[PDB]
Amino acid sequence: AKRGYSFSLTTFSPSGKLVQIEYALAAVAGGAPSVGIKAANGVVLATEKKQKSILYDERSVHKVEPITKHIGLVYSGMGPDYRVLVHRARKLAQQYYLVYQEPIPTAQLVQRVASVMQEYTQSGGVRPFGVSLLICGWNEGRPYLFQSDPSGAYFAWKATAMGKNYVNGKTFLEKRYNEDLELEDAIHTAILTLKESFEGQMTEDNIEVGICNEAGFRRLTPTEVRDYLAAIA
Amino acid sequence: TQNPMVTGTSVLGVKFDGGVVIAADMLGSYGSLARFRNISRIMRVNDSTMLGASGDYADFQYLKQVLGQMVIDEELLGDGHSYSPRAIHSWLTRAMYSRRSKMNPLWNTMVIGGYADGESFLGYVDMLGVAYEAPSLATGYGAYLAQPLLREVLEKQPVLSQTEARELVERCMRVLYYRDARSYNRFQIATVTEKGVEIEGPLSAQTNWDIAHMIS
Amino acid sequence: SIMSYNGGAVMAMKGKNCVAIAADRRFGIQAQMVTTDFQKIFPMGDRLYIGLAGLATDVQTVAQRLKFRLNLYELKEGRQIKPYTLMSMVANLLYEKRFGPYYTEPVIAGLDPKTFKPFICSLDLIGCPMVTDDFVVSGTCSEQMYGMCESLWEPNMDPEHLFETISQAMLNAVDRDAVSGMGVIVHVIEKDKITTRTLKARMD
Amino acid sequence: TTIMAVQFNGGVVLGADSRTTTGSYIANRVTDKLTPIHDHIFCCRSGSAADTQAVADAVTYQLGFHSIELNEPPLVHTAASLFKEMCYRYREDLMAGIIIAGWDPQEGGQVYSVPMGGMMVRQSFAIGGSGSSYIYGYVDATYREGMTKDECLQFTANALALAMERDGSSGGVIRLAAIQESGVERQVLLGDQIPKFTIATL
Amino acid sequence: SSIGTGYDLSASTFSPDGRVFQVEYAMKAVENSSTAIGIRCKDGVVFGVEKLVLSKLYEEGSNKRLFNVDRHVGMAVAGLLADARSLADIAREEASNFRSNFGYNIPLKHLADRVAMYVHAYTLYSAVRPFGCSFMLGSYSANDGAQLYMIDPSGVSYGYWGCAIGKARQAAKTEIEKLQMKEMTCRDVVKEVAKIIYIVHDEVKDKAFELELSWVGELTKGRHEIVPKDIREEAEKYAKESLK
Amino acid sequence: TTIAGVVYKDGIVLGADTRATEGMVVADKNCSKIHFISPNIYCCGAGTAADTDMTTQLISSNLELHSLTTGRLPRVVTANRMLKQMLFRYQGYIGAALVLGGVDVTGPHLYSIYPHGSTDKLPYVTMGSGSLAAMAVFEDKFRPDMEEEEAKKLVSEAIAAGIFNDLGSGSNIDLCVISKSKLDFLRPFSVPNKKGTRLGRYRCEKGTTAVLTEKVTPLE
Amino acid sequence: NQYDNDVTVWSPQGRIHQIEYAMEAVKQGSATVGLKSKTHAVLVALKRAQSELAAHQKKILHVDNHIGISIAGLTADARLLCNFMRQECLDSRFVFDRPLPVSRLVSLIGSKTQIPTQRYGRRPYGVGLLIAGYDDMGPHIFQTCPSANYFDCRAMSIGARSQSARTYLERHMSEFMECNLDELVKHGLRALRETLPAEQDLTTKNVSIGIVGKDLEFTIYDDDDVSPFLDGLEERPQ
Amino acid sequence: DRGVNTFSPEGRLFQVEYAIEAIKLGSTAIGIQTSEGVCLAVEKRITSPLMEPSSIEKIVEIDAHIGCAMSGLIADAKTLIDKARVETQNHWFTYNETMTVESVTQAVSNLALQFGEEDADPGAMSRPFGVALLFGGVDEKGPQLFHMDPSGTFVQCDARAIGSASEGAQSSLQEVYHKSMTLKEAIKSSLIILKQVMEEKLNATNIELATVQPGQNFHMFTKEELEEVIKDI
Amino acid sequence: RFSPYAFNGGTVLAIAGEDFSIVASDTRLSEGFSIHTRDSPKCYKLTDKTVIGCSGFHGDCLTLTKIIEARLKMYKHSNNKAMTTGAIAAMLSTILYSRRFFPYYVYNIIGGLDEEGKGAVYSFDPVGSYQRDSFKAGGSASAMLQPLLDNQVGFKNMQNVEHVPLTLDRAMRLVKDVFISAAERDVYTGDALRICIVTKEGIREETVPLRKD
Structure with missing residues (x-):
């Protein structure tokens, strides 16, 4: 038989900072690098997918996960915590579709997912998520890119970096980003900014990349990755 | 149970000198159809007590499961205490009434027979919760035909032997086969004594049909 | 009949680039008329209207609870509601009460924002949406309204021609119904203007 | 609807018709009323089509988990008890007459009959459904003690053919099933394959 | 095997080396209590527990460490007797629910698995503490045969040919290994079960003890019963004779 | 309402009418009765x-949630069990008669689901008000392993039989053809009935209606 | 020091300190003696007073016609446990129409007292009881403790300075079985006298006796009712 | 830090033992049982002369035959007295009779150790009542007096004193009380002991007095009626 | 469908005096047209000063008596007192009203002695309403006994009578005569009459045979 705690584990420090969220932001910082770029024509999400032992089956578990026909997710930090956030995002997208009969807007999904992330920073006997989320989507003739951090806040981005050396990524992205980029050119800079902190030569099994446009969100096949990966397309 | 499906008819019971005897036919009638012609309606509760039930047979199997377990659970302890015939009857009175008050009753009419402390016990339980003690008991159509025959002999002789009580029941079961449409000529004889509970197998009452010729 | 207790009739019609919605104004219990000025058509977003016909309580209750969900939708999302979105919102609201429904048959009429396209639909008491390109009717004199709309309606109609069509389709159908009448209000919805007219009708 | 299960030495023989009616119209003239629960356990369905199918799937789920947990082949008595516990607890809500017949390596061929009441009893043969009421005379007269497998197949096929002949709710096609240690073998007797019995004519 | 500045206070807390100390301290409670033995023969299982008499004022047959879970299942407990009776009641209820659902008597291999899951459920949370009791289960059937199982405070169940739990379980197991219990009849086994108990028992450290033995096999037709007074005195006479 | 489904060599053809009635009066002339479940399974509706x-x-919402978690195409048996267990739980109070049909990795599977919760697996099924007329066409002209165009003709004749004979059914014939590689959703397959165009125009002249009060509100 | 706060916390030795701390509560309360013969079960209890001006505490409680108890420790925990014992006896008589056996009732106490000793936030019942009862098996004397473990005893005494009473009952244990009702009560109070110091002894104001058996139901004797039992005493040894 | 139901090495609960320490801070109350009736006396303890003396009522009636004096935390007492007043009316409704003083005291004693954290109702107690009560009334057995404490140990008393100077007042009551005294002597004696232990001098507005007798109902002594017994200083 | 109630008959009578209380009832238990048993007394003793009677549905009678017996002990444990006749009568009123919407098909008559030592008889209805009276008859033959009780005991409708107080010897004769008259006309009353006498000494029981047909 079990009971369940009713008291919050995340509390305010004498300085005025929520200590558990501060350390949750440190968990994502030590995770695998992930980048997202909006290019007006479409959104591109790329992440480091290092299997390390080669005995691992690469195609079995994916880091880039689809939520609906036009929305996808990429993360940095802990795997198990992200997987729960995928299922919750997938469920919230379906609940919206049953009521309004319209595909969920990207900004509207993020607001609902961030509310769940806020809940775990205030509810009894639970720790915050150690995951920062990258949400991409296409609606109203416009591409979207959002960031959802452990606290429950959300930011709209043109281009952003996560995981290890994210500060080095963000400084590299602002030099590399342009207005009115092409979707196929956006994949080039996304796979290049990930190579800034990688060290062990990139193969089509080493990274995972997903694109989102007017046709919808889909994960790129290893054959499509191999074409882009050999320095040039 | 709101509507009974497979039902058993009359159950007899009469106490003699040094024990009680209970009899019931092995028939489970489905409305007018006699579907199951070989089912046990009389059970052994423990070592001194026995039970015979009328009405819905599916409801009886549930009581066979509960009372069966209650005896087993008591025998696990082995503290020297056992359920008396009066205790089983008192439980059954309280259990049938409880489900009556819930508006979901067990469609049953029981005859409790037992022998403890040198005393013979015979109890009756309705589906509503009506209970009493009687020297002779009969259920269903037995209360209309077999009971008058039981009360007649007990008026002349209150204390009967094991042989006299046995042939009395066999005489009552013959009449029940003549005038009850849901009865069958295959019954079990269950008897409690100081030695224990004993139930005999298939037994048929001999019937006379000589009155079929003397119409004209 | 539960629907025939208070009476009422609601009609919607399609034109070229305009939508028209008309309803009777009678509020009465069974046979006795009570109020001449009763609102049945409710604004939902400058260029989208809903007309409710059936039980007078459920007409007002649904309109209030739909406005409750409308404003929250327009605050969470930085956009005005779509006609298809509202249709599904009414369908969801009514189906929540499946085994105890609001005795009213909603009719939505209005133009699609940003895309200027006309839209009309009608729903059941339990919330079953159906889209048409011609007309949708609800009320006690449903059969009377069908007979007028099947003969008068034309494919492409201008705001002035659509007004004359929906007005005559209501007036004549209402005059054959005992529980409906006492004036007919018409809302003609255009991209530039909303024209509201109260027609001269029989007061018996 | 007519369902039948006869027990022999090596196992059991099951038989059922294929007609399911909603009033006077036949919704399905080729219904499979012999539902498998386990490897050697089968059941016969009669009554409400929605009720019989829902309980059968529930017992398959309950016994399936039971067989793995005990790490032994399931008993026929165990499978019949799971039908008993559902038909008795919800006797006022369900309209079902299930005959459970199968084989286990402990006891062998077994036939259990669970009617609408919710009771359970083991029988040598069991008949159920609306069409069974027409063959109570035939089965009682033709049944011989100690019949072989091939004799039980003929015994079930003849009784079903006579029931489908008279009953309006019964008809269609005969579906047979034989279960033993070797496994389960099923055969279907078609329109011309049905045992013909002469029609009374002057 | 020392760290205790935290890590050992809650059962839902792991230690740096990866150990749950709350379960281990409950295993210390069963080591402090007297030895409970039970061996499996060719045609059944015989139990034997040394019951330490704390005071001569207590009646003969008080504080029973032998329980009847089912009419065919026996139970021999060791450790804290408070938790022992509660685990017996849960086992009795589990055996009761099996007969109510399926009809036949519960197999011991399934019964031991179901109760061990209940024992393990108390080793996961901070709201509840693990049982400070280890117990043995034994039954005999015509199809299943002789079976013996043991469940420890953590919730681990294993089959045994001969098992002992208590004070000197290591000293007891060395004496069981000498016995050929795979060939021996359970009637001669009772003498050997009582023998090991007397050897294991400490006279200079502990006070006077009372012997309790149990049947479950072909001789008792499958039913778990207490050893009759005729055989119990015969077993005690055999054990005291070879004490020299 | 007349809905039907058939199983041919390659896949499944599903049929439906377009008449939706309120009581004994036609409410909708063109109504979709073939419903989307998954990119491989479609379901006709009645009741x-x-x-x-x-x-x-x-x-359809649950199976999209199911297919994304598994990462592969959903099965017809999964669609069947979900509809079977839900309708049984409500004891027939949800009056939904559904003809389910789709193509799996196992093959083509057709189901007929009743509001009470009973399901039947058959090569051909009919439900609705005009199901009696539609079944008679199948019981006369159906043959195992038939061609795609031959199966499309079989269902269209079955729906038409329910259209002309049954008062509950009418207007257009909708077809849905699902195979192993191709999915054809023919919305208007056949239009057997149409309105006899009005030769007498009843267009109301501008200013024939009397107006009491007028108010104009400008918009952006 | 760090393990003696909750019942859920185990000691490295393999002990629960909170249960052991609850055992000390029984030692704080005044002594009571419980003994049985072959036909009768007698409870003799010593009463304590906060002041000479205040009346003495109730030490013997009535549970049923055949079952009675004498409590030692916490008063509120005693009455709470007594209400459970009263209800269980009433439930058996309501259903089975027979007096509930003592062996059954004591087992029910060992089931209820076990629950709080294993759950967080809950505490053990800080009261020790001596249960006297008569059934089909004869007279019974049972001992229940803060720990769910219960004892079936020939004669037992628990409370403050109960060691002196415990030694006396051991030396005369063989005499109780063939002892009659009158003398068997004298044995109970004689053990209770040994707990008290040399100067003070038994009086009509501080002695309660509860007798149950074959002849009579459970009855509690108070002030003037206890005088026939006190008159005819052996007097205190030096 | 420990729980509310924690046992000491001595063998008693901390929260109960600390509740007894809370009474030693409250005002002193003296009750005397006599064959002619039971009297109850208490000091009001007025902090400021601006406060109304009639507002402080430490003696309150439960029924027409039972009165009670309270000490310690006055706020906690008003909850216990309210429970006692309901229990007497619940017994009157069911049995058509008046409860004995012992029965009423036992009913309040049931709510003694009804406190805890886990396995309790949302509206359950967290701490014991830090109140000593003196139930004094007349029933079928005559005039009776009972004393109750936080532990729930209720006992009959001939003369009992509880409060700040309870230990000093108890020794003074032992030297005066006997079995054959009168009610007028019991009233006279209680005033002499009370004026010795009080910080301020005895006055009619300073103290509160009430008597219960077999003749007539519970009577509260008014300012004028006190003057007859106050004049005997 | 299913009826939870059944009519079992039986008539219970009680007369109060100055120092005694008589409660009497027939021993017949029947259903429809058949007799279940000939030995089933409706009068039952609760305490040394109280005897209760039950008529109507026997299933409710058996359960209610066991509820009172359980409540008698619960009062005895808490209050340390034997429950008085007036307190039991007040308690039964609340027990019968707790089952207001599912009432007991039961007619109770409590007869015993009050606090002073005088005869007291309380009459109950199926719902809980009660009053104290000198005499009351309830059951199947209640309409047969009452008019004779109104005449002989109440001294009604007669002009010049001395008004003699009730005595035990005359009241015992009055009970035996009315049940003989009830057995001749009411089919539910017969077999044997059991009389319970509540005095300051104790409880007396006497059995007198009746018409068995």
Whole structure:
């Protein structure tokens, strides 16, 4: 038989900072690098997918996960915590579709997912998520890119970096980003900014990349990755 | 149970000198159809007590499961205490009434027979919760035909032997086969004594049909 | 009949680039008329209207609870509601009460924002949406309204021609119904203007 | 609807018709009323089509988990008890007459009959459904003690053919099933394959 | 095997080396209590527990460490007797629910698995503490045969040919290994079960003890019963004779 | 309402009418009765119109949630079990009669689901008001392993039989052909009935209606 | 020091300190003696007073016609446990129409007292009881403790300075079985006298006796009712 | 830090033992049982002369035959007295009779150790009542007096004193009380002991007095009626 | 469908005096047209000063008596007192009203002695309303006994009578005569009459045979 705690584990420090969220932001910082770029024509999400032992089956578990026909997710930090956030995002997208009969807007999904992330920073006997989320989507003739951090806040981005050396990524992205980029050119800079902190030569099994446009969100096949990966397309 | 499906008819019971005897036919009638012609309606509760039930047979199997377990659970302890015939009857009175008050009753009419402390016990339980003690008991159509025959002999002789009580029941079961449409000529004889509970197998009452010729 | 207790009739019609919605104004219990000025058509977003016909309580209750969900939708999302979105919102609201429904048959009429396209639909008491390109009717004199709309309606109609069509389709159908009448209000919805007219009708 | 299960030495023989009616119209003239629960356990369905199918799937789920947990082949008595516990607890809500017949390596061929009441009893043969009421005379007269497998197949096929002949709710096609240690073998007797019995004519 | 500045206070807390100390301290409670033995023969299982008499004022047959879970299942407990009776009641209820659902008597291999899951459920949370009791289960059937199982405070169940739990379980197991219990009849086994108990028992450290033995096999037709007074005195006479 | 489904060599052909009635009066002339479940399974609907829509949308929502978690195409048996267990739980109060049909990795599977919760697996099934007329066409002209165009002709004749004979059915014939590689959703397959165009125009002249009060509100 | 706060916390030795701390509560309360013969079960209890001006505490409680108890420790925990014992006896008589056996009732106490000793936030019942009862098996004397473990005893005494009473009952244990009702009560109070110091002894104001058996139901004797039992005493040894 | 139901090495609960320490801070109350009736006396303890003396009522009636004096935390007492007043009316409704003083005291004693954290109702107690009560009334057995404490140990008393100077007042009551005294002597004696232990001098507005007798109902002594017994200083 | 109630008959009578209380009832238990048993007394003793009677549905009678017996002990444990006749009568009123919407098909008559030592008889209805009276008859033959009780005991409708107080010897004769008259006309009353006498000494029981047909 079990009971369940009713008291919050995340509390305010004498300085005025929520200590558990501060350390949750440190968990994502030590995770695998992930980048997202909006290019007006479409959104591109790329992440480091290092299997390390080669005995691992690469195609079995994916880091880039689809939520609906036009929305996808990429993360940095802990795997198990992200997987729960995928299922919750997938469920919230379906609940919206049953009521309004319209595909969920990207900004509207993020607001609902961030509310769940806020809940775990205030509810009894639970720790915050150690995951920062990258949400991409296409609606109203416009591409979207959002960031959802452990606290429950959300930011709209043109281009952003996560995981290890994210500060080095963000400084590299602002030099590399342009207005009115092409979707196929956006994949080039996304796979290049990930190579800034990688060290062990990139193969089509080493990274995972997903694109989102007017046709919808889909994960790129290893054959499509191999074409882009050999320095040039 | 709101509507009974497979039902058993009359159950007899009469106490003699040094024990009680209970009899019931092995028939489970489905409305007018006699579907199951070989089912046990009389059970052994423990070592001194026995039970015979009328009405819905599916409801009886549930009581066979509960009372069966209650005896087993008591025998696990082995503290020297056992359920008396009066205790089983008192439980059954309280259990049938409880489900009556819930508006979901067990469609049953029981005859409790037992022998403890040198005393013979015979109890009756309705589906509503009506209970009493009687020297002779009969259920269903037995209360209309077999009971008058039981009360007649007990008026002349209150204390009967094991042989006299046995042939009395066999005489009552013959009449029940003549005038009850849901009865069958295959019954079990269950008897409690100081030695224990004993139930005999298939037994048929001999019937006379000589009155079929003397119409004209 | 539960629907025939208070009476009422609601009609919607399609034109070229305009939508028209008309309803009777009678509020009465069974046979006795009570109020001449009763609102049945409710604004939902400058260029989208809903007309409710059936039980007078459920007409007002649904309109209030739909406005409750409308404003929250327009605050969470930085956009005005779509006609298809509202249709599904009414369908969801009514189906929540499946085994105890609001005795009213909603009719939505209005133009699609940003895309200027006309839209009309009608729903059941339990919330079953159906889209048409011609007309949708609800009320006690449903059969009377069908007979007028099947003969008068034309494919492409201008705001002035659509007004004359929906007005005559209501007036004549209402005059054959005992529980409906006492004036007919018409809302003609255009991209530039909303024209509201109260027609001269029989007061018996 | 007519369902039948006869027990022999090596196992059991099951038989059922294929007609399911909603009033006077036949919704399905080729219904499979012999539902498998386990490897050697089968059941016969009669009554409400929605009720019989829902309980059968529930017992398959309950016994399936039971067989793995005990790490032994399931008993026929165990499978019949799971039908008993559902038909008795919800006797006022369900309209079902299930005959459970199968084989286990402990006891062998077994036939259990669970009617609408919710009771359970083991029988040598069991008949159920609306069409069974027409063959109570035939089965009682033709049944011989100690019949072989091939004799039980003929015994079930003849009784079903006579029931489908008279009953309006019964008809269609005969579906047979034989279960033993070797496994389960099923055969279907078609329109011309049905045992013909002469029609009374002057 | 020392760290205790935290890590050992809650059962839902792991230690740096990866150990749950709350379960281990409950295993210390069963080591402090007297030895409970039970061996499996060719045609059944015989139990034997040394019951330490704390005071001569207590009646003969008080504080029973032998329980009847089912009419065919026996139970021999060791450790804290408070938790022992509660685990017996849960086992009795589990055996009761099996007969109510399926009809036949519960197999011991399934019964031991179901109760061990209940024992393990108390080793996961901070709201509840693990049982400070280890117990043995034994039954005999015509199809299943002789079976013996043991469940420890953590919730681990294993089959045994001969098992002992208590004070000197290591000293007891060395004496069981000498016995050929795979060939021996359970009637001669009772003498050997009582023998090991007397050897294991400490006279200079502990006070006077009372012997309790149990049947479950072909001789008792499958039913778990207490050893009759005729055989119990015969077993005690055999054990005291070879004490020299 | 006349809905039907058939199993041919390559896949499944599903058929439906377009008439939706309120009592004994036609409410909708063109109504979609073939419903989307998954990119490989479609389901026809009959009985209560609101109950058919909401039950379909919930199963389609659950299977999309199911297919994304598994990472592969959903099965017809999964669609069947979800509809079977839900309708049984409500004891037939949700009046939804559904003809389920789709193509799996196992093959083509067709189901007929009743509001009470009973399901039947058959090569051909008919449900609705004009199901009696539609079944008679199948019981006369159906043959195992038939061609795609031959199966399309078989269902269209079955739906038409329910259209002309049954008063509950009418207007257009909708077809849905699902195979192993191709999915054809023919919305208007056949239009056997049409309105006899009005030769007498009843167009109301501008200013024939009397107006009491007028108010104009400008918009952006 | 760090393990003696909750019942859920185990000691490295393999002990629960909170249960052991609850055992000390029984030692704080005044002594009571419980003994049985072959036909009768007698409870003799010593009463304590906060002041000479205040009346003495109730030490013997009535549970049923055949079952009675004498409590030692916490008063509120005693009455709470007594209400459970009263209800269980009433439930058996309501259903089975027979007096509930003592062996059954004591087992029910060992089931209820076990629950709080294993759950967080809950505490053990800080009261020790001596249960006297008569059934089909004869007279019974049972001992229940803060720990769910219960004892079936020939004669037992628990409370403050109960060691002196415990030694006396051991030396005369063989005499109780063939002892009659009158003398068997004298044995109970004689053990209770040994607990008290040399100067003070038994009086009509501080002695309660509860007798149950074959002849009579459970009855509690108070002030003037206890005088026939006190008159005819052996007097205190030096 | 420990729980509310924690046992000491001595063998008693901390929260109960600390509740007894809370009474030693409250005002002193003296009750005397006599064959002619039971009297109850208490000091009001007025902090400021601006406060109304009639507002402080430490003696309150439960029924027409039972009165009670309270000490310690006055706020906690008003909850216990309210429970006692309901229990007497619940017994009157069911049995058509008046409860004995012992029965009423036992009913309040049931709510003694009804406190805890886990396995309790949302509206359950967290701490014991830090109140000593003196139930004094007349029933079928005559005039009776009972004393109750936080532990729930209720006992009959001939003369009992509880409060700040309870230990000093108890020794003074032992030297005066006997079995054959009168009610007028019991009233006279209680005033002499009370004026010795009080910080301020005895006055009619300073103290509160009430008597219960077999003749007539519970009577509260008014300012004028006190003057007859106050004049005997 | 299913009826939870059944009519079992039986008539219970009680007369109060100055120092005694008589409660009497027939021993017949029947259903429809058949007799279940000939030995089933409706009068039952609760305490040394109280005897209760039950008529109507026997299933409710058996359960209610066991509820009172359980409540008698619960009062005895808490209050340390034997429950008085007036307190039991007040308690039964609340027990019968707790089952207001599912009432007991039961007619109770409590007869015993009050606090002073005088005869007291309380009459109950199926719902709980009660009053104290000198005499009351309830059951199947209640309409047969009452008019004779109104005449002989109440001294009604007669002009010049001395008004003699009730005595035990005359009241015992009055009970035996009315049940003989009830057995001749009411089919539910017969077999044997059991009389319970509540005095300051104790409880007396006497059995007198009746018409068995």
